Design a protein around this ligand. Structure first.
Ligand SMILES: [Cl-]
Ligand SMILES: [Cl-]
Ligand SMILES: [Cl-]
Ligand SMILES: [Cl-]
Ligand SMILES: [Cl-]
Ligand SMILES: [Cl-]
Ligand SMILES: [Cl-]
Ligand SMILES: [Cl-]
Ligand code: NA
Ligand code: NA
Ligand code: NA
Ligand code: NA
Length: 129
């Protein structure tokens, strides 16, 4: 599913991401924009053989099981395929664990490089939330 900008903002708010760990909704929408262009089915292979999945490009090294990432963990206790669902529940629940891990949203290098420090509220501007 490719979400619209305000549609994803609303879904993320519904699932409790707005101000989760102190990160405003626009942070999350911005990160989703640059990780996946709002596409739940986005996948990206990493040089290390891990793969990133879904709207927030969650990695198989630590967070989900895909059966093809040697030596990896599955800390969200999910098949990586759940991260590709039109239902963002599994992505959101897993993102909550990731952002709680110590480094906040810096875990998403695209967030650090493209969203951090910017006018992230622009990402929810105009939306009925
Ligand atoms: Cl957009
Ligand atoms: Cl915001
Ligand atoms: Cl497996
Ligand atoms: Cl594996
Ligand atoms: Cl594990
Ligand atoms: Cl599994
Ligand atoms: Cl949803
Ligand atoms: Cl933080
Ligand atoms: Na994701
Ligand atoms: Na894994
Ligand atoms: Na999901
Ligand atoms: Na950018």
């Amino acid at each position: 599913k490719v979400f619209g900008r305000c549609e994803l903002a609303a879904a993320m708010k519904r699932h409790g991401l707005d101000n989760y760990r102190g990160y405003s909704l626009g942070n999350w929408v911005c990160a989703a924009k640059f990780e996946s262009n709002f596409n739940t089915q986005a996948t990206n292979r990493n040089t290390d053989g891990s793969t990133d999945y879904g709207i927030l490009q969650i990695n198989s090294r630590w967070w989900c099981n895909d059966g093809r990432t040697p030596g990896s963990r599955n800390l969200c206790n999910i098949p990586c395929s759940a991260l590709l669902s039109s239902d963002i529940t599994a992505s959101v629940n897993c993102a909550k664990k990731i952002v709680s891990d110590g480094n906040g949203m810096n875990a998403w290098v695209a967030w650090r490089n493209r969203c951090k420090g910017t006018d992230v509220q622009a990402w929810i501007r105009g939306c009925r939330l």
